[PDB]
Design brief:
mainly alpha; Ribonucleotide Reductase, subunit A; 2 strands; two-stranded antiparallel sheet; binds mercury (II) ion; EC 1.17.4.1 (chain B); 66% helix; homodimer; 13 helices; binds fe (ii) ion
């Protein structure tokens, strides 16, 4: 029931962001939500190319690094690779088939495309600092710690994807597939979408920012300044990404779009809360793998942990959720220097 | 069966382009087929901003045009808008779930992204030549002439997406769904992918080139020069897209990547030929209508029909199909000034 070009002449200003008639014409002259058009413009305005960035000296710096420092740096980079590897394909595979307004459709495509540039930049960094990158890259999929810190991301997406397919193939209802009952409830798919988005908002808003803190730790010590310039560029982009997911989330909950979506946001509020808690906890646990051969004189599981509670509280509130952690001031405001 | 992050450690250098294990790590330090990385790099180097082109004088030119000419121009722009609407989303929805090598996955995403910049450029143009763009945009979907000329593009994509869903959900086999039998065959899914790629190759190969001729016809005459500059940037990107689809089809039929696929392509050859020919035909039928209420200055149904035969022959040969028409030299060599590729 999905079509790459729906044949009904529909007023795109009146479709819901999701689950409406699939987008036919891509026009940008009017928007139901101008915020998406604005993000597209900003993101295109920020277009940059990694290879332009000079990381020549980062090879020296890295080589000079104490092994536990190299381990920290690399582990962090491998996590970044994982997250942008997923974020490069996921929004397109999971969201495009559900979007019903053109401005959001293109935003998603621009957002996803920008994640591939991030992925390209890690390849640029890695090949410029190691001897065989296959070592770093081959250690992502099987790094239990990595998969432990990243656990659950591929899950929201894949389930959202599976249900959307059944919904497109069979339509709403209960069906019999190979002698088994399969229920396709649209309310339920909306709930899986709502949850995937919140999960992605956490990924964009917290998982990356935590990784930035490590990256910048080195920069403040005047090491790996190429990587840092890249990270700043990447960070500038993820900021747009999170602005987009917060908006989607907030608009859905305001009930101004699909009203059933606002009742759903309501029903699943504890689930939303729980996943962020779970995410924030996974990042803390990472601290214990990062600091295995030891920490640095500017970063340890403690500061890490505090920054994490710090940022999580900021994000959860941005999306109207209750704060799980004790309020505090930025445990590392120098980071705000690079952050911008 | 589709996963956004396959947990199996796999050698990405030995997966087939399609139908293997879904890509997990996005790395560009190595590739099975470097054409895809090369394509990504050139496309990134070609990045351009529509709004950066002055289209301010196109308004009076368009206003000054004769009605048969406004019609030809606008109709052509509507068709471009349609093709890029489809190509901005389809390669992503249709191919991403089936790609098993990273360079190809990222190319497809980069390719589709570039098509959205083309779409944004049409809004830039349209907003600058008409008082109310809705008049144009609200007529593409149901315009008889446009659905006719575009006929079948979406269907190839939609059927492939549908079978892919069934394949990922139920796996290969004969199954039941609501009292009816639903057979799922990888070989058939492989054939639908080949035909859909053949179809997109024709879209990139000929459907856009016919449209370029029309727009550049106005630029030769020094009219709608803002639109021309945009179309020229668009044509440069399309040339890369076409290189991509050609390499994908040639790698597929050759047997080097997927032997079964090679067998399948040989068996649907006539089918591939017919669809290519049917696309050429539609472009001709378009030009027939287009020029019936009056023909533009420098281009007419006839020269246009010859150009279609001329590119069609070149494009068909490039992916191993028999030439369907009479061998001739280019009928509008002036087009080359505009096609920088
Ligand atoms: Fe990213
Ligand atoms: Fe992002
Ligand atoms: Fe295009
Ligand atoms: Fe294209
Ligand atoms: Hg999601
Ligand atoms: Hg998700
Ligand atoms: Hg660090
Ligand atoms: Hg950190
Ligand atoms: Hg929720
Ligand atoms: Hg919520
Ligand atoms: Hg297709
Ligand atoms: Hg296709
Ligand atoms: Hg023309
Ligand atoms: Hg074929």
């Amino acid at each position: 029931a999905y079509t790459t070009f729906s044949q009904t002449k529909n007023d795109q200003l009146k479709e819901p962001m999701f689950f409406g008639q699939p987008v036919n014409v891509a026009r940008y002259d009017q928007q139901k939500y101008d915020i998406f058009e604005k993000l597209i413009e900003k993101q295109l305005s920020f277009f940059w190319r990694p290879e332009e960035v000079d990381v020549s000296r980062d090879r020296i710096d890295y080589q000079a690094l104490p092994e536990h420092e190299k381990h920290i740096f690399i582990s962090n980079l491998k996590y970044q690779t994982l997250l942008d590897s997923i974020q490069g394909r996921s929004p397109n595979v999971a969201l495009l088939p559900l979007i019903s307004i053109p401005e959001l459709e293109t935003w998603v495509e621009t957002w996803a495309f920008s994640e591939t540039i991030h992925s390209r930049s890690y390849t640029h960094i890695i090949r410029n600092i190691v001897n065989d990158p296959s070592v770093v890259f081959d250690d992502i999929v099987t790094n239990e710690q990595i998969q432990k810190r990243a656990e659950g991301i591929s899950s929201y997406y894949d389930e959202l994807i599976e249900m959307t397919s059944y919904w497109h193939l069979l339509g709403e209802g209960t069906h019999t597939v190979n002698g088994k009952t399969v229920t396709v409830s649209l309310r339920e798919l909306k709930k899986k979408l709502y949850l995937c988005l919140m999960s992605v908002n956490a990924l964009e808003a917290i998982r990356f920012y935590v990784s930035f803190a490590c990256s910048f730790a080195f920069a403040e010590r005047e090491l790996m300044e190429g990587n840092a310039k890249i990270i700043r560029l990447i960070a500038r982009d993820e900021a747009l990404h999170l602005t987009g997911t917060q908006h989607m989330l907030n608009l859905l909950r305001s009930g101004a779009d699909d009203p059933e979506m606002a009742e759903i946001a309501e029903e699943c509020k504890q689930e939303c809360y729980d996943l962020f808690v779970q995410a924030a906890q996974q990042e803390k646990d990472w601290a214990d793998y990062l600091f295995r051969d030891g920490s640095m004189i500017g970063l340890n599981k403690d500061i890490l942990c505090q920054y994490v509670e710090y940022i999580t509280n900021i994000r959860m509130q941005a999306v109207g959720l209750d704060l799980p952690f004790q309020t505090r001031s930025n445990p590392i405001p120098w980071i705000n220097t690079w952050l911008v």
